[PDB]
Amino acid sequence: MEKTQETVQRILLEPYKYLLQLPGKQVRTKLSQAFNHWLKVPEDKLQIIIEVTEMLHNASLLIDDIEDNSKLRRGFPVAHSIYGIPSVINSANYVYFLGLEKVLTLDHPDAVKLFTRQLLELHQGQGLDIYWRDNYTCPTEEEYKAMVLQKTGGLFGLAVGLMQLFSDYKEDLKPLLNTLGLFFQIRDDYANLHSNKSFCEDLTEGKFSFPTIHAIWSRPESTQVQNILRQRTENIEDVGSFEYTRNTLKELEAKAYKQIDARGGNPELVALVKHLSKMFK
Amino acid sequence: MEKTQETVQRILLEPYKYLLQLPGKQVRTKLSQAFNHWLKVPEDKLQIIIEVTEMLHNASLLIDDIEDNSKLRRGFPVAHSIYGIPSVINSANYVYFLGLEKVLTLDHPDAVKLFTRQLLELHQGQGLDIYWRDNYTCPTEEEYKAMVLQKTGGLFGLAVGLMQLFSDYKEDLKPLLNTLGLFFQIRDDYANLHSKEYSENKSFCEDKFSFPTIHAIWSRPESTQVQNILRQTENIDIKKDLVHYLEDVGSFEYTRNTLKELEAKAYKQIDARGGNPELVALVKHLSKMFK
Numbered sequence A: 001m002e003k004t005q006e007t008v009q010r011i012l013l014e015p016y017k018y019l020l021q022l023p024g025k026q027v028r029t030k031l032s033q034a035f036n037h038w039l040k041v042p043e044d045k046l047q048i049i050i051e052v053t054e055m056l057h058n059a060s061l062l063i064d065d066i067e068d069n070s071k072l073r074r075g076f077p078v079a080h081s082i083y084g085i086p087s088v089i090n091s092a093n094y095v096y097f098l099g100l101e102k103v104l105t106l107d108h109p110d111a112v113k114l115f116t117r118q119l120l121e122l123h124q125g126q127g128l129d130i131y132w133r134d135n136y137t138c139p140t141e142e143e144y145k146a147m148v149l150q151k152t153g154g155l156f157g158l159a160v161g162l163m164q165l166f167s168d169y170k171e172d173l174k175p176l177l178n179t180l181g182l183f184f185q186i187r188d189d190y191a192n193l194h195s196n197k198s199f200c201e202d203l204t205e206g207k208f209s210f211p212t213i214h215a216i217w218s219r220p221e222s223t224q225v226q227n228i229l230r231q232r233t234e235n236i237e238d239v240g241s242f243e244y245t246r247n248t249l250k251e252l253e254a255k256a257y258k259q260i261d262a263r264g265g266n267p268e269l270v271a272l273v274k275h276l277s278k279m280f281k
Numbered sequence B: 001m002e003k004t005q006e007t008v009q010r011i012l013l014e015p016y017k018y019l020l021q022l023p024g025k026q027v028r029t030k031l032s033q034a035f036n037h038w039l040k041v042p043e044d045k046l047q048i049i050i051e052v053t054e055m056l057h058n059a060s061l062l063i064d065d066i067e068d069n070s071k072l073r074r075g076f077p078v079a080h081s082i083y084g085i086p087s088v089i090n091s092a093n094y095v096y097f098l099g100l101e102k103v104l105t106l107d108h109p110d111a112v113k114l115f116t117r118q119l120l121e122l123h124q125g126q127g128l129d130i131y132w133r134d135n136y137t138c139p140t141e142e143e144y145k146a147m148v149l150q151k152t153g154g155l156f157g158l159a160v161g162l163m164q165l166f167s168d169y170k171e172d173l174k175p176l177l178n179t180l181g182l183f184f185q186i187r188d189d190y191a192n193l194h195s196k197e198y199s200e201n202k203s204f205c206e207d208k209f210s211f212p213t214i215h216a217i218w219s220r221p222e223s224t225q226v227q228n229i230l231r232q233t234e235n236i237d238i239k240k241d242l243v244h245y246l247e248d249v250g251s252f253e254y255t256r257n258t259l260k261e262l263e264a265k266a267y268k269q270i271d272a273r274g275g276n277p278e279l280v281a282l283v284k285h286l287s288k289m290f291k
Ligand SMILES: C=C(C)CCOP(=O)(O)OP(=O)(O)O
Pocket: A023, A024, A025, A026, A027, A028, A074, A151, A152, A184, A185, A188
């Protein structure tokens, strides 16, 4: 049972390990560690939380790449181009439940409730993202943000919320988490599209991210075009798109620094935000 | 957030609601009812468990159809032809977590543990099935059986396990569950190759190994007639060929014998648990297929 449980687990995890070994930032690791400046979670619990968070993050990327027909991830072919969609779905989903299993080792009665809630949020966000893309209905800036706070902030919320289960630190971290979730997402959007080639391809495909959203709604005919496209569904700043994105990022950065200062400072979190902000300067 | 949650929910669940309308046997409900002879679960808990089980099962079917590249289910388009693979993955996975959420309403400390274990088993079984197919690894009979017990019985095991959490009856039903899991799957394998009526109702217009072909491959290890037949004819012809080869090597007889042993074992194990007329009658009816 040891030798072949281990073979099975290794087989099932192959697509996931492919992605995990690619060069990446582990921002969720770094964020959680920086947040522990406030929360003072014991190392053993923190390690579990970080593992859960990174597991779910990587698994969700496998799924994301299938859901939007991406070709590359972290510079390399997406897992499903190598292993097939079937094995990748299975692998990513297996990791979700291995994440659940690991949450149970936290031995806290609220942990599973929080994990369930955050996974449901994540799927709501993802599901909207997909729906818009499939119907070519470009979200507004505000719709995009709300979706991102579910799809991206869902996991940030899980890490910090699980930490809060093991901490007497009671300050409201939700505003800062919202800022950070938007910041990270929009920064990714910017990093992916700033060098026309990916940008134009996105527009062709109906792949919506912060720069293309700005570009689409910038044209006056946008409203009437988008309204025709939204009738098919259950759907309700004169500057360049990259400049607008850079400006949004600078605002989000400044806001983060304000919110960190409002919580008494956090040099490690500040240094992380500053490093990540080089991307758009 | 009130009127809006409902819209989003409906978007997310559309592929799942489509699949709910498709023909199906609802055996998991029938087996749960049969196990309730012993377990006598309070109706409020039983209703939740059955809903959880059916949700997880239907979600797994959405995923299964993507994972094995099915084109039809019971003669109708697979969900992902209608809604696309991205929406279906998202829908099925959302339902998994809605299932988790509902398991929490059972308010028993062991329910989530059971859920986790059984979902992990399900994924291991599915994952092996996929791996073998993708990597041209023909399993042995013993490996196939072990895979089937995970893939086919993972959710069966969850239903009964969750039931037993709210039952005074605490005897070990796992051996019987294993026998039943194998029996159901191998009977399906058999019926799908040996019975035109059963094939027509279930796998209408469908072209992936199974108990009989595994026996045929490993019993005549030098032959490659199975592989060669599958690589060839429109499916009626391919199937005839496969069927004749299986006939000629004794794979149908071997499968019938395996099923008879599984049947007899089930009756012995049911008797050892104190008897269960409903389950016995169901096994007997299902056993006609191979008599
Ligand atoms: C939801 C989002 C924004 C995914 C991208 O995250 P990362 O930029 O952290 O990707 P890796 O470093 O983990 O590759």
